[PDB]
Amino acid sequence: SATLLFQKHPPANIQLFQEVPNGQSKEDTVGRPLPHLAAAMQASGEAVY
C-alpha cells in the first residue's frame, strides 16, 4: 500500500429525517424540506449582494 497512488472510492450519502404528520396540510410547510427561498436566484446570478 505504500506504492499505491491515491485511489478514490465511490461516494455514499444517506440523510434520514422525520416525515411530517400524515394529514398535515400541504400549505403548512413547517417540518417539510422546503429549499432556501432565494436558491433559484442564487443559482441564476440574479440574487443581489
Binding site: 432565494a38 436566484m41 440574479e46 440574487a47 443581489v48
Partner: protein, 50 residues
Amino acid sequence: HFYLETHCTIAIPKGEEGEMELFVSTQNAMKTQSFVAKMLGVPVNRILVR
C-alpha cells in the same frame, strides 16, 4: 396646479422576485404601489414606494 416641481418618478428594478423600489413625487404612495403592481402583474408586497 402649477406646482413648481412637476410630476417625477424614478424606478429601480432589483432583478429579484419582481421587486421594484420607486422614488415618486406623489401624495398617494399606496395607489402608486398598487397601480405599479397591477401593471407588472406582481403582488403588492414586491413594490416599494418612497
